[PDB]
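pipeline/complex-builder :: batch 7 item 3
reading input block
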Amino acid sequence: IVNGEEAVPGSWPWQVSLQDKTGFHFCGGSLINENWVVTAAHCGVTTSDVVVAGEFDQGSSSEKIQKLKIAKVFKNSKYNSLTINNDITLLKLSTAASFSQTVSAVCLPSASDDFAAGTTCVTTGWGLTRY
Amino acid sequence: IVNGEEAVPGSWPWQVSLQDKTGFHFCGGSLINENWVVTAAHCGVTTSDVVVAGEFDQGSSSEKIQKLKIAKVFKNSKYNSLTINNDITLLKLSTAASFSQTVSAVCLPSASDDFAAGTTCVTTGWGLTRY
Amino acid sequence: ANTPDRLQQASLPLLSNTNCKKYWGTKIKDAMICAGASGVSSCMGDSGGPLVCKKNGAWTLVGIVSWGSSTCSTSTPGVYARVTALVNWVQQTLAAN
Amino acid sequence: ANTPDRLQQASLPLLSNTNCKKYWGTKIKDAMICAGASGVSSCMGDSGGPLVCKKNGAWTLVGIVSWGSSTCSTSTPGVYARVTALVNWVQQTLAAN
Amino acid sequence: RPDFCLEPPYTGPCXARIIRYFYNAKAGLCQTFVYGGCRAKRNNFKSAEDCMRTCGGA
Amino acid sequence: RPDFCLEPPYTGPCXARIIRYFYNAKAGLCQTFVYGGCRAKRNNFKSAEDCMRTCGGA
Amino acid sequence: CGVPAIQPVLSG
Amino acid sequence: CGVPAIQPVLSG
């Protein structure tokens, strides 16, 4: 996030980090319950990647996190790799996340919810702070 | 070779190119007979690498070369990986080179031969022409 | 550059489709929602993370970070997967698995 | 930064060990022979190739490209595996295989 | 070799941080870069070996 | 991570052209370079995976 | 869902 | 050995 700010640690407890088998962060995601993460289809997640829950400081080797294996990847079959439309994938965890002060789920909208233009919303992540 | 010059094509017929399985040149070598190439021990050659004989222009896909598989690698056991002393390895080819106008062997000296300081000699290769 | 070690956040406004299309035109499709152009920008490594808005006091997933400016410009709209257009698929997938 | 497509050659003088050690000192060992410092230099990708000297109408392998200046300087001695010191091992290896 | 091997690496518009390989003709070998996850150009490979088999020597 | 992960890649004095990996702390990932074949420093790996398992995040 | 145990602080 | 069918030509 460019021109964002540091979050209060643990205050976005659904935020997960998607990492390869060496620990390299390539995408974020959101817990929607103890067994499922929603992320983008273009992230290309496979069952060799892992879901890291409870993280704040990726440079702290001591921080207490849950590295969770992925049992199955459900890429929306209508994801359009040309137009980028329908850009969503679900990850089913092989072992449930253990919810806690720093790990819990985001709510999901109903299909009919109207979120008005101009509403102040928030986005979070470990992406670049400078391109 | 820095500040060398282009060879006459085929005029160094013992010069081989040692390449990995994708065709990437990492070292030279010299044919000493139809079945054996001598090269440096620090080149780290393995039986997955290949000996390319008869080459002049590595950018020409139409040149008539012999890609030769390596059956066994004989690194001198006295090669000293700290001091670089005894830097020699022999490659036994699994199929013989076919000697020809552009492919043939260099002679080997005897252990007692003397090559006097100041003798003008020649070295050849596809190494960098500028560092 | 390299990513920050520590989790970042930014507040930002949802954009109407009409205002988003003033920049991105017909690249904006029916399962996309735009936000930002407000001095912040999602950027590489943010993809797949959340865009949340409060609904009756509870943070609710409205977007998934998807794509945008190729230099993460903070004056152009960021584009997010529109979760309302995709949540029926989410619920069906959970129910079946 | 990339190698030449076409095979290169250079003429260069053999150096005495004493003159070679004036630059490289005790790094020169008994199965090494030095050549060059004469306006040419072997460089990355040349290793393992030949240093040949011609006598009686025939070319003979006297050195194997080994090591030298870490920037391939043409004014310092190149170092080559000294084939006379290693050819007994060559012949033994061929005879056994 | 294919001319697409001479194009600079292309991160694209998506915001992932995915490690890919591209052929760098100035160096003569494949190098890693960060790909955004969508709209890849052809000089974009999942391994160094694929990259070098396709573009080596360009 | 080990401090050797922060050192620039080292080609060394030998004259081979061997593809190796080093961790680039400025970029945050491993990158290829040309190794001369002897006297390797520790930020020098035969695969990207080895490099990232040893130096990733330095 | 959607209610962090640790409240976020946003400069706004 | 040692006698190329194509004779090398060296400047100098």
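note: Chains G and B do not touch (no CB pair under 8 Å).
queue -> next item
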